[PDB]
Amino acid sequence: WTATSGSCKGRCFELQEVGPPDCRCDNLCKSYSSCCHDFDELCLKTARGWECTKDRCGEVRNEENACHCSEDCLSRGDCCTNYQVVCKGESHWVDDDCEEIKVPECPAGFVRPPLIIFSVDGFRASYMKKGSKVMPNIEKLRSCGTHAPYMRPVYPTKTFPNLYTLATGLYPESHGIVGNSMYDPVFDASFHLRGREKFNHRWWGGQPLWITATKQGVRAGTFFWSVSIPHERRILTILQWLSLPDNERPSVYAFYSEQPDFSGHKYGPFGPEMTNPLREIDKTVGQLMDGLKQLRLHRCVNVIFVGDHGMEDVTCDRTEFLSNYLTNVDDITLVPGTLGRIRAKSINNSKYDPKTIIAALTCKKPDQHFKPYMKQHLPKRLHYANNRRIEDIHLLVDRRWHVARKPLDVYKKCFFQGDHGFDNKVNSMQTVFVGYGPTFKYRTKVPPFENIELYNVMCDLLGLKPAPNNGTHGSLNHLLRTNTFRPTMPDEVSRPNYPGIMYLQSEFDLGCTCDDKVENKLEELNKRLHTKGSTKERHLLYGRPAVLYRTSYDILYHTDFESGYSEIFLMPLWTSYTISKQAEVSSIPEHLTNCVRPDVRVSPGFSQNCLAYKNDKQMSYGFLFPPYLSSSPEAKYDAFLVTNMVPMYPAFKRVWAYFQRVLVKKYASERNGVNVISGPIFDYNYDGLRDTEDEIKQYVEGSSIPVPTHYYSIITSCLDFTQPADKCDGPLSVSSFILPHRPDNDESCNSSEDESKWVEELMKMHTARVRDIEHLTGLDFYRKTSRSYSEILTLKTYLHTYESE
Ligand SMILES: *[C@@H]1O[C@H](CO)[C@@H](O[C@@H]2O[C@H](CO)[C@@H](O[C@@H]3O[C@H](CO[C@H]4O[C@H](CO)[C@@H](O)[C@H](O[C@H]5O[C@H](CO)[C@@H](O)[C@H](O)[C@@H]5O[C@H]5O[C@H](CO)[C@@H](O)[C@H](O)[C@@H]5O)[C@@H]4O)[C@@H](O)[C@H](O[C@H]4O[C@H](CO)[C@@H](O)[C@H](O)[C@@H]4O[C@H]4O[C@H](CO)[C@@H](O)[C@H](O)[C@@H]4O)[C@@H]3O)[C@H](O)[C@H]2NC(C)=O)[C@H](O)[C@H]1NC(C)=O
Ligand SMILES: O=C(c1ccc2cc(Br)ccc2c1)N1C[C@@H]2[C@H](C1)[C@H]1CN(C(=O)c3ccc4[nH]nnc4c3)C[C@@H]21
Numbered sequence: 001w002t003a004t005s006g007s008c009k010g011r012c013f014e015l016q017e018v019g020p021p022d023c024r025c026d027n028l029c030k031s032y033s034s035c036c037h038d039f040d041e042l043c044l045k046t047a048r049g050w051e052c053t054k055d056r057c058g059e060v061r062n063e064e065n066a067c068h069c070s071e072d073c074l075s076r077g078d079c080c081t082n083y084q085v086v087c088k089g090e091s092h093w094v095d096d097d098c099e100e101i102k103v104p105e106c107p108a109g110f111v112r113p114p115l116i117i118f119s120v121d122g123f124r125a126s127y128m129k130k131g132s133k134v135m136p137n138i139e140k141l142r143s144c145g146t147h148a149p150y151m152r153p154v155y156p157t158k159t160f161p162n163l164y165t166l167a168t169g170l171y172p173e174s175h176g177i178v179g180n181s182m183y184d185p186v187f188d189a190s191f192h193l194r195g196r197e198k199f200n201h202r203w204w205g206g207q208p209l210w211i212t213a214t215k216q217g218v219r220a221g222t223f224f225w226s227v228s229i230p231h232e233r234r235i236l237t238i239l240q241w242l243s244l245p246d247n248e249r250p251s252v253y254a255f256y257s258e259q260p261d262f263s264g265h266k267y268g269p270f271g272p273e274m275t276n277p278l279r280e281i282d283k284t285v286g287q288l289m290d291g292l293k294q295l296r297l298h299r300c301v302n303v304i305f306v307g308d309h310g311m312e313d314v315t316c317d318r319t320e321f322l323s324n325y326l327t328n329v330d331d332i333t334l335v336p337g338t339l340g341r342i343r344a345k346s347i348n349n350s351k352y353d354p355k356t357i358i359a360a361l362t363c364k365k366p367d368q369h370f371k372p373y374m375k376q377h378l379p380k381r382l383h384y385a386n387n388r389r390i391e392d393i394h395l396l397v398d399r400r401w402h403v404a405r406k407p408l409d410v411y412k413k414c415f416f417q418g419d420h421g422f423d424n425k426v427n428s429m430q431t432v433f434v435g436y437g438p439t440f441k442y443r444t445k446v447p448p449f450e451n452i453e454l455y456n457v458m459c460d461l462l463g464l465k466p467a468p469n470n471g472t473h474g475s476l477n478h479l480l481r482t483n484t485f486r487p488t489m490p491d492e493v494s495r496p497n498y499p500g501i502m503y504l505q506s507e508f509d510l511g512c513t514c515d516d517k518v519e520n521k522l523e524e525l526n527k528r529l530h531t532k533g534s535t536k537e538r539h540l541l542y543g544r545p546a547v548l549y550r551t552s553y554d555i556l557y558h559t560d561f562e563s564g565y566s567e568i569f570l571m572p573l574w575t576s577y578t579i580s581k582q583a584e585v586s587s588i589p590e591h592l593t594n595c596v597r598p599d600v601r602v603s604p605g606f607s608q609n610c611l612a613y614k615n616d617k618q619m620s621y622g623f624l625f626p627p628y629l630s631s632s633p634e635a636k637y638d639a640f641l642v643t644n645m646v647p648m649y650p651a652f653k654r655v656w657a658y659f660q661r662v663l664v665k666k667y668a669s670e671r672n673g674v675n676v677i678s679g680p681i682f683d684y685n686y687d688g689l690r691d692t693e694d695e696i697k698q699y700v701e702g703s704s705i706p707v708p709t710h711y712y713s714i715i716t717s718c719l720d721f722t723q724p725a726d727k728c729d730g731p732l733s734v735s736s737f738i739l740p741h742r743p744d745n746d747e748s749c750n751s752s753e754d755e756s757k758w759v760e761e762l763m764k765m766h767t768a769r770v771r772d773i774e775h776l777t778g779l780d781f782y783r784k785t786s787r788s789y790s791e792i793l794t795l796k797t798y799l800h801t802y803e804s805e
């Protein structure tokens with residue numbers, strides 16, 4: 001109940017939310033149908049439109065007008081935004097040359113530069129270039145301020161998950177808004193675009209920027225606008241709030257535009273009808289910047305122009321129907337469209353089995369335009385699994401396609417020509433970032449970055465301490481002129497042991513054998529040095545990774561590679577090696593095919609054993625340093641040490657062997673040498689974070705050898721590829737992956753073919769940031785370089801996408 005008998009007189013766009021059943025006058029009262037009776041009359045004035053004309057100049061103040069051209073309007077904070085231009089011979093902000101803002105130039109009373117977040121729905125990255133002729137204001141912000149060629153949204157590339165990631169710095173799996181549509185099994189409640197449940201606080205996790213500001217005594221404009229409030233009114237309200245007295249004035253504001261998403265859906269991302277929405281948005285920016293100028297705030301405010309996701313060409317004909325795949329179609333519930341999420345329709349149906357549904361959706365048709373996944377096998381870069389609102393079965397839909405349950409759904413619900421929601425690496429889903437103002441850099445282009453990084457920066461622009469989030473604070477310091485956040489490296493928690501030769505061969509009873517008893521002061525003196533670390537400078541280029549949890553581990557040196565060997569998990573946590581452009585591949589000699597050698601530096605009780613592998617019919621083993629890249633026949637024996645061994649399904653060994661035999665050398669040739677760090681990952685609970693020993697769900701049968709859920713590699717070289725990886729004087733270049741350790745290759749529909757046709761594609765799907773590997777392993781990489789730590793953070797956030805230009 002709302003007793004809407006009170007009045008909005010004096011209270012138009014009030015900043016505090018008044019408690020029901022008192023009537024509201026806030027920018028969201030319409031959405032709750034709770035505004036007072038006179039809200040339209042007093043607060044949504046439209047008379048005369050939005051622009052001064054010559055004949056209004058110096059007029060008598062008529063309180064009925066949407067905005068004012070009277071002499072008193074400036075002090076009343078309520079002129080039309082073009083007032084000084086029409087009536088005072090001033091120029092529009094867009095017509096002024098840009099001039100570096102070297103220091104903030106703010107009115108007295110301003111304790112910090114305000115931040116204005118200008119968010120545009122469905123603003124595809126390529127519009128910056130492709131629409132630049134019709135967006136003069138946006139193009140001025142872009143070229144005078146700091147810009148990225150594009151910003152990576154989060155998955156799914158939908159509106160609510162992305163705006164709430166911008167507000168919080170969190171992955172959807174963590175903030176809880178994992179779709180535009182959700183069922184929460186614990187609440188037994190549904191979140192829908194239409195309705196009132198979406199307003200309940202229990203959906204909204206983390207701590208949004210506006211709550212962060214309020215709690216730390218920074219005042220915030222209310223971020224949300226009811227759809228019906230026109231953009232011109234939204235802008236004038238922000239401008240009016242900026243004229244409030246110092247003690248009442250917010251320091252952060254949000255504007256939101258439903259365009260160009262709205263027209264993109266109807267016309268496609270590049271339909272000729274899209275020119276208009278782009279003009280209209282640019283006009284709105286112009287109004288804001290003209291209004292800031294009148295307020296003398298145009299060299300004081302930091303403006304962020306940011307999109308939530310792009311827009312792709314999608315039509316009704318490109319729909320796949322689950323009914324062409326499943327018999328039991330009416331026993332499932334499908335969340336459809338540009339992603340699929342499947343659950344049982346009834347929890348009382350004991351004949352529901354996710355494995356049979358998955359198999360009926362797997363590689364069933366030649367040109368199949370979606371791939372089924374259990375959520376925990378989704379690429380780790382998506383971070384889309386650790387929430388009860390995310391259905392166990394997920395469908396990654398190909399760009400340009402839809403999935404639906406049955407055809408009736410599609411023609412009983414072509415209308416739309418654009419949509420979004422696809423894999424956040426897809427180029428058509430990328431969006432925009434421009435920063436403009438005193439705290440941002442002047443005419444600077446920065447590399448593409450992910451929108452999870454922005455919360456930290458917005459907190460930095462406001463002097464706030466960010467809540468715990470998934471940003472890497474310092475990774476975007478290069479966007480900022482000042483207010484940088486100067487992070488320190490985390491402290492190493494565990495120091496390694498450096499074991500020497502401590503065990504005789506006969507102390508080992510591992511059921512392993514090697515044809516190695518085939519036997520000097522030239523060569524013996526030299527293998528001693530190699531096991532002490534003589535060549536560590538070549539294979540460990542950026543220091544050893546720090547271990548950021550309590551554990552027992554050993555550093556193991558070798559001619560060709562160095563490793564940090566875990567006595568707890570019985571395998572390395574990481575293995576580091578350098579492959580120069582000139583390195584040669586060799587095969588594993590015949591006599592050494594089955595060789596595994598005990599490591600006399602490491603006790604039997606902390607070693608793997610070959611018998612567990614013999615007796616486990618499902619499980620085989622691989623090596624972290626590949627025997628194929630040994631520097632010499634003598635060096636190859638090190639590659640067969642039991643301490644270089646890791647458990648691998650034979651189907652996975654197909655992927656791994658190809659990567660080590662073919663791809664490592666190919667990348668070395670291409671990048672002028674590469675440093676490679678490889679290792680296992682254990683994430684049985686799919687939270688994106690290292691599992692402890694007591695969370696391991698799977699061992700090699702009979703033994704305490706834990707099975708990784710994933711294997712990673714980090715591959716580093718010189719950004720200036722004229723320098724070799726091992727002698728690089730400047731910035732580094734990196735690519736990484738986190739490959740699922742799976743007992744079949746069902747993910748790769750072409751996997752019966754040669755590895756040269758499918759392996760690298762699979763690797764690409766599972767591209768990763770070094771930072772993702774850090775969360776998954778508890779290690780900190782790149783500890784000793786010549787580079788600044790901020791530059792290193794940026795490197796750790798880099799995702800190599802393999803999308804074209
Ligand atoms: C991205 O960044 C984010 C933010 O930093 C990272 O997420 C954090 O990870 C932490 C470690 O996993 C996690 O800490 C846990 O907090 C538990 C209580 O937390 C409450 O309070 C916080 C702070 O205000 C709040 O944010 C939480 O809100 C969650 O839950 C509600 C819904 O229920 C949502 O509104 C909200 O969105 C959020 O949900 C998300 O997180 C939870 C996990 O907490 C998931 O369940 C959801 O799926 C969703 O993703 C909470 O209200 C705390 O109880 C935990 O402590 C247990 O474990 C420790 C181990 O040290 C143990 O010692 C403790 O005793 C305790 O164990 C006891 O409980 C167990 C389980 O019931 C039981 O088995 C034991 O026997 C014990 O009795 C834990 O410390 C932190 O909450 C989140 N923060 C957020 C916002 O999600 C995230 O990791 C980053 N991602 C990546 C890839 O890096
Ligand atoms: O008020 C805010 C807001 C919310 C959070 C915000 C966070 C920040 Br930070 C800044 C502005 C914000 C504005 N919003 C009003 C609109 C939009 C954002 C939400 C999504 N939505 C839809 O109807 C919708 C839109 C495009 C779609 N495409 N496909 N399906 C779609 C469904 C309802 C809400």
Ligand SMILES: [Ca+2]
Nearest residue numbers: 683689690691
């Ligand atoms: Ca985990």
Ligand SMILES: [Cl-]
Nearest residue numbers: 158179180181
């Ligand atoms: Cl959705």
Ligand code: NA
Nearest residue numbers: 613616619620
């Ligand atoms: Na076996």
Ligand code: NA
Nearest residue numbers: 745746748751
């Ligand atoms: Na296959």
Ligand SMILES: [Zn+2]
Nearest residue numbers: 122159261265
């Ligand atoms: Zn949309």
